[PDB]
Structures are given as C-alpha cells and as structure tokens.
Symmetry: C2
Subunit: 179 residues, 2 copies
C-alpha cells in the first residue's frame, strides 16, 4: 500500500502525454525542429545541446545519438552536449558558428544558463530550439521553435515528455538525412 | 510532413504506459523496490546503479537525486552510478553486503549488467532490475524485476523506466521520513 501514489503518478503521466498529444501545435513544433536540425547538418552545422538536472542527460543522449550516426564521412561533430551561470554560454561563444543550432532544455522556462546560452546563440547567428514546460517562463518566445509541455507542477512530468520528444526527433532527423 | 509518424509514436507511448499501468504486478514491483532501497539506506547500505546507452542516463539521474537528498548527516553516499567487466569490476571494488545493484537493460540482455549482477550476488548484494520485452537472459536473476511489456525498439521502454525512477524517488522519500 503505496499503490495509490504509484498509479497516481503514472496517471498524471498519461494525462500530460494525452494533453501534450491533442494540441496540434505541439505535434508541429516537433516536425519543424527535426527539419531544422537536419537542414543544419546538411549545410554542415552542428547543434549544441544543454539542459540542467535531469535535463542534462536528455541533452547528452540527444547528442550522442546524433553524433553516433552522422560522424561517418563528415568533419567535426554533428552534435555536442555542453559539458556540465555562464557555463553554457561561454561554450556557445567558444565554439558556436553561424548556421549551427542551440537545443536548450528547461522544464521550467526559467533556467538562467539556458537564457544566457540563447543570448550567446543569437550573437553567433545560431538558430535556437527549446524544450520547455509550464507557461514556458522567461524563455517564452525566445526560441526559433519552442516545444512546450502543458504541465504546471514538478519537472517529472515534463522531463518524461522531453525524452519522447528527443526520441521522435532522432527518428525524424534520420528520414530527413537518408532523403 | 511527418504529422502521422509523430502522433504515431506518442500513441505507442500512451499505449505502453497504459499496458504498463494496468498490470498490478508492475505496481507492486515498483513498490517493493522503493521499500527495499529505503531499508538499505536505513541500514547504512548504498545502491550502485548502471545501465547502457540512453539507460545510463537514468542511472545517473536516479543516483544524483538520491545522493543530493540523503547525503546530509550520513556517511558515504547513498547512491553511486557506475562509470564488459566495466560494471562488474566496480561492483567488486566497492560493493558491500547489504548494498543494492539497480541494473537497467531495455533488452534484458546486456553483458555488462549480466556480469554486474553476478558480482552483485558474490558480494551479498540485493539486485533490482528495470527491463523491457520478455526480460532477456536476465529473466529471473534479480530479486525484483520491473518489466516493461514492450517488444520493439528501446525508446518506449526507456520512457517508462524513467517514470519509474521518478516514482521510486517519491516512494523512497516517504519511506525515509516515516
């Protein structure tokens, strides 16, 4: 008997996923994003990814997967995950290049680092794709493409959707690359 | 235009969650695990966690979250996440009787987790797994398996596995402060 709590949480999960999936704007973001990353690689850009906490892993998986597939007969690295307040932005200034992208992940919409990164990303002439949650905090509308998770509680429920997105993104990029 | 493909995947998720959720056994495994983990901290033990690819990430979030909460006025660390014999050597090097191994393998067939588990056993350690599909060569070796009844590409399993880790942290919470 914590059976309630458990079933509960998982319920919240199915809710949020359900809420996430009904809104068409969500489903579009995902598509344009997959498209934009993809174009970027073909034009030989890389994507810098970052996020805090639980979100940092999501940002690694993202880049490891992509670098896993596209390193072959291509220079540099396709994806790099910002190895962790100015910690993601100094890296952006360190290596970012016009035409590269910046995938910042913040469940809350409020992460100082990601906001500084985003700023340094605009300075470098880089496109910005964010993975957010709640009202999309202070980052709300700074991104070339926000994929926002209609959850208003703890990060949990947002992260979980984040990872599915990151997953589906990898697939969509693939079918874009083989094309 | 992948509008279908997307919805498709999101559905598969919703399904998998659905099917995971219905099974009562799943829910008791979750609960048994958080209790086992908790009691072990209570007895001064720690949990070692590990997993491959996308799953390593879960094993780090699991450990980081717990360590960040129970470090205070407790010696050592409550959780540590490991880095073929890469997980096992680690278990031989630090594992103490009464500690736990939380091995994660969306297939059930990772050689490193398999060997980790056997080191786990040699050290007198309890073992908890987060698997998917039929449970692979791992079927049966853990003291508590949380299987995710999915049979295709890891994506859908990992996605559950992380919810589970989240839920385990809450239960562990309630269990610590009672």
């Amino acid at each position: 008997m914590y059976q309630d709590l458990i079933r509960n949480e998982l319920n919240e999960a199915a809710e949020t996923l359900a809420n996430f999936l009904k809104d068409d704007a969500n489903i579009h973001a995902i598509q344009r994003a997959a498209v934009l990353l993809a174009d970027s690689f073909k034009a030989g850009g890389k994507v810098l990814s970052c996020g805090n906490g639980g979100s940092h892993c999501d940002a690694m998986h993202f880049a490891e997967e992509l670098t896993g597939r596209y390193r072959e007969n291509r220079p540099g690295y396709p994806a790099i995950a910002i190895s962790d307040n100015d910690i993601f932005s100094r890296y952006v200034e360190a290596v970012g290049r016009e035409g590269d992208v910046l995938l910042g992940i913040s469940t809350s919409g409020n992460s100082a680092n990601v906001i500084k990164a985003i700023a340094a990303a605009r300075e470098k002439g880089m496109k910005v794709i964010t993975l957010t949650g709640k009202d999309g905090g202070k980052m709300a509308g700074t991104a070339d493409i926000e994929i926002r998770v209609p959850h208003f509680g703890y990060a949990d429920r947002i992260q979980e959707i984040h990872i599915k997105v990151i997953h589906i993104l990898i697939q969509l990029i693939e079918k874009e690359m083989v094309k």
